[PDB]
């Protein structure tokens, strides 16, 4: 099926109509998404089939066809772009300066942008176009707004 690098929608026909459950990044022949989007299920790409290769519920990440390839990191200073792919809407780039998730195991970048649940897996990029992480796992703060982590895997 389609193996070209880029951002893709993750769809399902198991519910009413065709519903977008998330988004992912195709890079170096490997499809990258969040675990809560697919629950580790196989994916279809036209006639082809993509099988899970690696995944971790705690990191909330999964790769298909090969190991996790994305290793760019947020520099902790510069603005980034969420390449948001919302359900039924065209892909749009939104620039923001990320905040911080201070955890007991170190700090993580965080983007304060609220999009529908089906936007999960949309990549966050640096000025070079490199994927520094995926959008879709985070928290809801006091006022009801959503703040996602800049979730990045490890490249072996």
């Amino acid at each position: 099926g389609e193996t070209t690098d880029g951002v893709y929608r993750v769809m399902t026909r198991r519910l009413l109509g065709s519903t977008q459950v998330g988004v992912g990044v195709m890079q170096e022949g490997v499809f990258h998404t969040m675990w809560h989007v697919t629950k580790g299920a196989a994916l279809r790409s036209g006639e082809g089939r993509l099988d899970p290769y690696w995944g971790d519920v705690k990191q909330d990440l999964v790769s298909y066809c090969g190991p996790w390839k994305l290793d760019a990191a947020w520099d902790g200073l510069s603005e980034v772009q969420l390449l948001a792919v919302p359900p039924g809407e065209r892909a749009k780039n939104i620039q923001t300066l990320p905040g911080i998730f201070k955890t007991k195991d170190g700090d993580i970048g965080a983007v304060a942008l609220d999009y529908p649940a089906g936007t999960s897996g949309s990549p966050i990029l640096d000025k070079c176009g490199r994927v520094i992480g995926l959008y879709g796992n985070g928290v809801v703060i006091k006022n009801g707004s959503y703040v996602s982590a800049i979730t990045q895997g490890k490249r072996e």
Binding site: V10, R14, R44, D126
Partner: protein, 39 residues
């Protein structure tokens, strides 16, 4: 069955809509992958 459809290239867009704030939050991550606020 789930399927993928191409949505575009991954490129930085100069003159993109600049929005969102930068909050500093004390958070906790559980074994099920869920983030929570620590107070």
């Amino acid at each position: 069955d789930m399927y993928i459809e191409r949505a575009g290239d991954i490129t930085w867009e100069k003159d993109a809509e600049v929005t969102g704030n930068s909050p500093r939050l004390d958070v906790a991550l559980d074994e099920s992958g869920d983030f929570s606020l620590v107070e």
